[PDB]
Design a protein around this ligand. Structure first.
Ligand SMILES: OC[C@H]1O[C@@H](O[C@H]2[C@H](O)[C@@H](O)[C@H](O[C@H]3[C@H](O)[C@@H](O)[C@H](O[C@H]4[C@H](O)[C@@H](O)[C@H](O[C@H]5[C@H](O)[C@@H](O)[C@H](O[C@H]6[C@H](O)[C@@H](O)[C@H](O)O[C@@H]6CO)O[C@@H]5CO)O[C@@H]4CO)O[C@@H]3CO)O[C@@H]2CO)[C@H](O)[C@@H](O)[C@@H]1O
Ligand SMILES: *[C@@H]1O[C@H](CO)[C@@H](O)[C@H](O)[C@H]1NC(C)=O
Ligand SMILES: [Cl-]
Ligand SMILES: [Cl-]
Ligand SMILES: [Cl-]
Ligand SMILES: [Cl-]
Ligand SMILES: [Cl-]
Ligand SMILES: [Cl-]
Ligand SMILES: [Cl-]
Ligand SMILES: [Cu+2]
Length: 235
């Protein structure tokens, strides 16, 4: 159970974005139905009034929280991966348009899932803005909590993988468009019951065996990290 408070750009807080530049749902409940339109941008997908200006090569940091800013972020039980996708805003998230910019599942060295490190990072994880065409974009941050993913929602609707999905409206201003955006996957649609990483038992299968759901990260992506970039408490 977690939500996005807002974003930072190059280490500078852009301010509370909830229902402003984040298409925020009314609460922190998970999405579980893989075929629902809720998979796109969660349960209240609509245009919100602001879009955060960035340039290619900037660091864009999502900041998550549980109940209040910079709290326990997400329950520690919710071990799982984190991805970020991008699509042009014109799509409204419909069609084959989502391109993966970031994937982090399990860190063998550190013996931690992406979620574990997200908590340690005070909810902060980042991508570097790619050299796509200037214009308006949706950045879809997705946490998959796997604590009940031994079952499939489609089979048992009281269990299943949980998806915490947040779409940020981002305007890319300066960019030479040297890596124009390739084709995307659909949400809903990309994840099905057979997809690797959707059904998995984190308790009896080694985390080292986990494979996150495709698609693979676009070769045009400039990477990213799960790490605190800014101290919210200093505001
Ligand atoms: O190592 C020895 C052997 O281990 C075996 O593996 C076991 C494992 O040990 C056991 O841990 C595991 O059990 C898991 C269950 O399958 C799973 O269902 C359970 O889910 C919990 C979850 O942990 C918890 O975080 C979650 O809390 C939710 C809560 O439901 C929700 O209502 C609340 O919502 C509030 C919002 O948070 C709040 O913001 C808002 O204001 O109010 C909301 C409403 O109050 O949100 C919280 C999260 O924040 O609840 C679910 C239960 O519903 O987690 C268990 C683990 O923690 O099962 C394994 C199998 O038994 C191996 O199998 C064996 O081989 C080993 O040897
Ligand atoms: C899952 O979503 C699909 C598509 O919206 C819907 O038809 C189906 O009823 C949903 N499943 C449940 C249990 O609500
Ligand atoms: Cl839960
Ligand atoms: Cl609700
Ligand atoms: Cl759902
Ligand atoms: Cl604006
Ligand atoms: Cl950190
Ligand atoms: Cl550029
Ligand atoms: Cl589908
Ligand atoms: Cu939860």
């Amino acid at each position: 159970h977690t939500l996005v408070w807002g974003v930072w750009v190059n280490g500078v807080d852009q301010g509370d974005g909830r229902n402003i530049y984040i298409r925020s749902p009314p609460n922190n409940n998970p999405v579980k139905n893989l075929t629902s339109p809720d998979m796109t941008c969660n349960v209240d997908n609509r245009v919100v009034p602001k879009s955060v200006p960035v340039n290619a090569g900037d660091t864009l940091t999502f900041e998550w929280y549980h109940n209040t800013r910079d709290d326990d972020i997400i329950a520690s039980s919710h071990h799982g991966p984190i991805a970020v996708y991008i699509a042009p805003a014109a799509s409204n998230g419909q069609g084959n348009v989502w391109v993966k910019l970031f994937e982090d599942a399990y860190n063998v060295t550190n013996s931690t899932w992406a979620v574990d490190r997200l908590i340690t990072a005070h909810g902060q994880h980042s991508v570097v803005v790619p050299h796509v065409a200037p214009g308006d974009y949706l950045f879809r941050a997705e946490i998959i909590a796997l604590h009940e993913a031994d079952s499939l929602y489609s089979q048992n609707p009281i269990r299943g993988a949980q998806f915490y999905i947040s779409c940020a409206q981002i305007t890319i201003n300066s960019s030479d468009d040297s890596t124009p955006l390739p084709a995307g996957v659909p949400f809903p649609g990309a994840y099905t019951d057979s997809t690797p990483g959707i059904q998995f038992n984190i308790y009896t299968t080694p985390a080292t065996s986990y494979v996150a759901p495709p698609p693979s990260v676009w070769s045009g992506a400039l990477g990213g990290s799960i790490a605190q970039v800014g101290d919210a408490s200093l505001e």
